[PDB]
Amino acid sequence: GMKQIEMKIEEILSKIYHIENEIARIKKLINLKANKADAYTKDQAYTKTEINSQMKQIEWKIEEILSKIYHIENEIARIK
Amino acid sequence: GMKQIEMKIEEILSKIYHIENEIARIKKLINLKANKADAYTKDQAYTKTEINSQMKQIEWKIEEILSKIYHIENEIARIK
Amino acid sequence: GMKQIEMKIEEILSKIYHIENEIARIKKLINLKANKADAYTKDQAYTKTEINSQMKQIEWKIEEILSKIYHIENEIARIK
Numbered sequence: 001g002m003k004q005i006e007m008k009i010e011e012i013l014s015k016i017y018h019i020e021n022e023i024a025r026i027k028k029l030i031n032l033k034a035n036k037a038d039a040y041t042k043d044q045a046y047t048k049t050e051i052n053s054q055m056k057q058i059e060w061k062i063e064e065i066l067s068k069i070y071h072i073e074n075e076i077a078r079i080k
Numbered sequence: 081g082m083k084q085i086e087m088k089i090e091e092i093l094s095k096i097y098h099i100e101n102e103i104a105r106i107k108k109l110i111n112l113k114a115n116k117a118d119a120y121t122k123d124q125a126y127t128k129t130e131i132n133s134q135m136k137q138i139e140w141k142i143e144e145i146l147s148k149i150y151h152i153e154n155e156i157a158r159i160k
Numbered sequence: 161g162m163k164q165i166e167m168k169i170e171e172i173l174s175k176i177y178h179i180e181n182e183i184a185r186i187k188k189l190i191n192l193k194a195n196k197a198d199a200y201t202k203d204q205a206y207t208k209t210e211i212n213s214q215m216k217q218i219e220w221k222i223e224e225i226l227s228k229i230y231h232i233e234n235e236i237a238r239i240k
Contacts (some may be wrong), residue, residue, distance in 0.1 A: 001082060002082070002161060002162070004167075005082075005085055005086070005089065005165055005223065006098065006165070008089050008093075009089075009165065009168055009172075009209070010170075012089075012092055012093070012096065012172055013172070015096050015100075016096070016172065016175050016176070016179070017148070019096070019099060019100070019103065019179055020175075020179065021104070022103055023179065023182050023183070025215070026103070026106060026107070026110070026186060027186070029110055030110065030186065030189050030190065031195070032116055032117070033110070033113040033114065033115055033116065033194075033212055034113070034114045034115065034116045034119040034121075034194045034199060035116075035191040035192055035193055035194060036192055036193065036194045036198075037123060038119075038121050038194075039114065039119045039120070039121070039122070039194040039198075039199045040120065040122060040127065040199070040200065040205075041194075041198050041199070042198060042199075042200060043128075044127050044128060045125055045126070045127060045128060045202065045205055046128055046131055046205075047204050047205060048203075048204055048206055051131070051206055051211070054131075054135060054178060055214060055218075058135075058138060058142075058218060061140055061142055062218075062221055062222075062225075063143075065145055065146070065225055066225070067100055068149050068153070069149070069228055069229070069232075070151065071227070072152060072156065072232060073232070075156050075160075076156070076232070076235055076236070076239075079156075079159060079160070079239060080185075080239075081162055082162070085162070085165055085166065085169065088169050088173075089169075092169070092172055092173070092176065095176050095180075096176070099176070099179060099180070099183065103183070104182055104195060106183070106186060106187070106190065109190055109238075110190065112195055112196055112197070113193040113194065113195055113196065114193070114194050114195065114196045114199040114201075115188070118201050118202060119194065119199045119200070119201065119202070120200065120202060120205055120207065123208075124207050124208060125200075125205055125206070125207060125208060126208055126211055131211070134211075134215060138215075138218060138222070141222050142222075145222070145225055145226065145229065148229050148233075149229070152229070152232060152233065152236065155236050156236070159240070160238075
């Protein structure tokens, strides 16, 4: 009965040691993860697609502007 | 005394089993978190507000440009 | 032999208690980390440098436009 208990104590001490190592590993894994406080949520930042869409809109207005300028330069050349 | 020790062994084995489970859960939770290496910090990316402010400044220059163009088109029409 | 086992049970219960506390701490650390689902990967967002580069390109086209407009206004003034 007493030798029995001893073998169970050994089993428990091994498991505890294995657990302590798992916990050490877990801590290191946690330190490689980004904190809420350092990362931007999706609400707080635009995606690449959203930015592309806004840049596109600007690009179209720039093209409209350039076509109008070219048309004006032409009108002026005809006046001269 | 020996039955006492036995009841404590049972308690310990239950706690250990419960701990092992907790650790299994924890690992899975960790895998749903973003790594520092894959996420952008706040100083590496602009917020929506910061982007809005920069887009606004561009828009004001566009409005100035378009007013000037419209005005020029009118000056030309009057010349013709 | 039996008092020996008792002192080992105490030693084990202390380790278990210490482990439980480590796990409690770990859980709280995990809740301060950003979830993949709430953060943007680097693939999904532009950096400040990337945005600056795109803004700069727009600003250069705006400068070119404003110089052309000024030049045009002057040509028109000379015609009148």
